[PDB]
Amino acid sequence: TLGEELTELQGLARQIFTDHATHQRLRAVETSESRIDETLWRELAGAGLLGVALPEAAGGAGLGLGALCVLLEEQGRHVAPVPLWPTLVAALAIAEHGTAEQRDLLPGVVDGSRRLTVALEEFGVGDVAAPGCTAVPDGDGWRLSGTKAVVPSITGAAHLLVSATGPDGPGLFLVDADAPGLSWERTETTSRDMAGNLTLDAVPARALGPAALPWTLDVARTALAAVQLGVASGALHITASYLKEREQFGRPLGTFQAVQHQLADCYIEIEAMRVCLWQAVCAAEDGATDGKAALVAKWWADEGGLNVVHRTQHLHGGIGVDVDYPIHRYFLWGKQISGTLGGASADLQRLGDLIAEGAAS
């Protein structure tokens, strides 16, 4: 059945991530130029995990956003350094909103030779739904001028989906990473990713379909919430194990009521995160387009997920800030994810406008 395939998916990803997201390998990758584990990427491709969410006509399994979320959740459990959500959200945007020519890029994503990223953010106000980056018509193509902020995992990406406002409003456009007029500055982020601040000077581009931008934002929000769920789950698991071991005052820290209550609040928040994630997935597969379910999943990620990784830092005491101990990476990932596409307060504002607008319908 579908659940059995998703269980198989989960076990496979877990084994691959477990074999490569190790003390030694995380340190090697997080001090490299790309901050990307190319070995892990090739292993994922070879196990079919890059293809599992993508269409059959491109060699994938055709299992869609649910399979993507299962893979991303395992990835977050291990803070595994590969750009799965930028590449696979971009690929799902192409699959669902691209031209035939654009969908011909998907086979290379399935087999691991072609990575992508998405440039959905801007400095300042940075309304992701109203990019300041401009798109100008040029024959049957477009030229883009503007700047985008902190494009994730830019190294080795062959193409980028870039949000921009054209004459008919915001849209999503495919750009080759070697396009003329395109340049970036590498910038290191909280999570230790190597992002790019992107400058576009009349860069040639090709549009995706008219619904690509709001669709891609909902999927990206859902995907980020999947990673955050895995980050928080892994953080809680490590912290629970540690608090059984560490004794003070003659007993395990895990026996103190305040410790148990902080752990329980993490557990509660994780359960809440998880059911709202799957509601967002189910809503997307059932053709919802109002955006509320994705924002609810994302707010839980932004607020609950960030609470969890702050509590798991605190519960560790000094060893939790040692960079040779694992938990600090969950803090760094959780913190970065909770602001990606905007933080908790922004997401409440956007969700509140959707609620108000729907009530006035």
Partner: protein, 380 residues
Amino acid sequence: EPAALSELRAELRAYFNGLLPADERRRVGEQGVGGERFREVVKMLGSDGWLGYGWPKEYGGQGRSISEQYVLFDEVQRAGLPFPFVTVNTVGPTLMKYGTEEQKKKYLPGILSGDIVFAIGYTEPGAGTDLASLTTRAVRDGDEFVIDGSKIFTSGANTADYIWLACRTDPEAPKHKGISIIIVPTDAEGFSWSPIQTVGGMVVTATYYSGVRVPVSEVVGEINGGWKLITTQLNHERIGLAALGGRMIRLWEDVVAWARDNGVLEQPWVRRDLARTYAKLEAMRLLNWKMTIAVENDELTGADAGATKAYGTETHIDVQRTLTGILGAAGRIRPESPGAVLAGQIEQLSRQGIVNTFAGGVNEVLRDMVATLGLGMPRS
């Protein structure tokens, strides 16, 4: 399929409308099991077939699904009417499991028909959260038990026909292994009760048992095995808190509409608060749904039940606080006073929501259990 639930919804409105009037609904809903017209409603619902809607047809019920059951609970609350949750959804199903064939025959039909109502007799002045320390005693005399003690906050005892009574039957056993459940008729000689008024508007009771005598066949389950019965009925005591959340979702919707029509919805702070409570209500209702499925399947873990109940009851209070703020100056007006909004329901529910973070399991203890049962944390 979802057309069926819609149709069920529309049928139940017509039906409750033919029973309720206006304020009466919000009057019998505020009193709860302790109110005067409670039995009048129960008997009406019972003869019309709605009490056994979710019961197995083996025991005379319709065997309807969880989806349909929730529509029923949501619509009774919406109408203002009280529903005998404890008796129909908590006592009957524990009797169906642990009752003798004889016990089932005496009680279940009258529960079904709306003729028998039960009240829960657990809590004592000396044994609240530490319920396993209860001291109300039942001593063997022959084939009778002699019951001496008292209970406190016995909701509905003034309107019930029987008490589901937790008693100490073996004073020398481990505390969890010295307890039995005994059914005590409320007309028994030596039984008495006195009212307790709550800040929320409900009247509950203290109940007293002085030499009360009950045949030994009125013990449910095995003697000294009462703890597993207590837990079984306490777990079923979450399907009610799920329906309670259903009521707060409806009130949230009503506040959205109210704020839309007077411009309060144009305030950024209002929109943000409605967004945050929407997101927390979404998690609650989804967790409630999963946990109802588990409990009616005999697969709910202690960790998940505790996490869901503590999260849901704290969310009801968060939503009550937040919607009161959105209501502005009218947020402080009691039901039946001029200017009240939505008949003062959110004002009155704010004074009641404070109960449910310690009733049906104390949220501190539920968090302990989440840590120990859910994460394997050591005790002590």
